[PDB]
Design a protein around this ligand. Structure first.
Ligand code: NA
Ligand code: NA
Length: 178
């Protein structure tokens, strides 16, 4: 619990460095950058506390917000790391076939078969969740001309249904972690 959240020990303001954040469909302010540092500072920039904050962490307070001592200001899953969409749209399953690239596992979930666990044809397959607009047009990742296709590494856990509406910052899949 403590290893996967930040609770500040004194009042101060949140200062985030190297951060990209977006609000998802659950009303969570989610960090989508991978080398973010969160600092508790005073009004003059003196550092009180400093923490690294992982990709996918949820913030209760954004950059520049004042917080009081004892307040929990970030939370992330201790045992998984997410794959998060950077764009809003609708989910489209790609190369996701039961028994060949994914298996059902149990609430139920789709689990991506790693390379060795796949049928002959499946080893050439690359399961992905593509984000499309309402019409089915490919959506591009912001900053690039690259499509918002998120491939799933083996053991990735997916709970989304195909075709479902999705918002930027929503988790596409979770990679099981120690
Ligand atoms: Na946590
Ligand atoms: Na969003």
């Amino acid at each position: 619990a403590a290893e996967s959240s930040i609770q500040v020990k004194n009042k101060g303001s949140i200062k985030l460095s190297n951060v990209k954040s977006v609000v998802n469909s659950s009303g969570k302010l989610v960090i989508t950058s991978r080398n973010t540092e969160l600092k508790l500072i005073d009004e003059f920039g003196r550092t009180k506390e400093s923490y690294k904050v992982p990709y996918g962490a949820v913030l209760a307070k954004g950059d520049g917000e004042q917080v009081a001592g004892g307040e929990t200001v970030a939370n992330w899953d201790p045992h998984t790391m997410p794959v998060i969409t950077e764009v809003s749209g609708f989910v489209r399953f790609t190369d996701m076939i039961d028994g060949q690239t994914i298996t059902r596992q149990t609430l139920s979930s789709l689990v991506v078969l790693d390379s060795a666990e796949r049928t002959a044809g499946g080893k050439d397959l690359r399961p992905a969740l593509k984000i499309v607009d309402a019409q089915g047009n490919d959506v591009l990742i912001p900053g690039t001309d690259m499509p918002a296709q998120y491939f799933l590494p083996g053991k990735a856990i997916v709970q989304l249904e195909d075709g479902v509406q999705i918002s930027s910052g929503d988790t596409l899949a979770r990679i099981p972690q120690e």
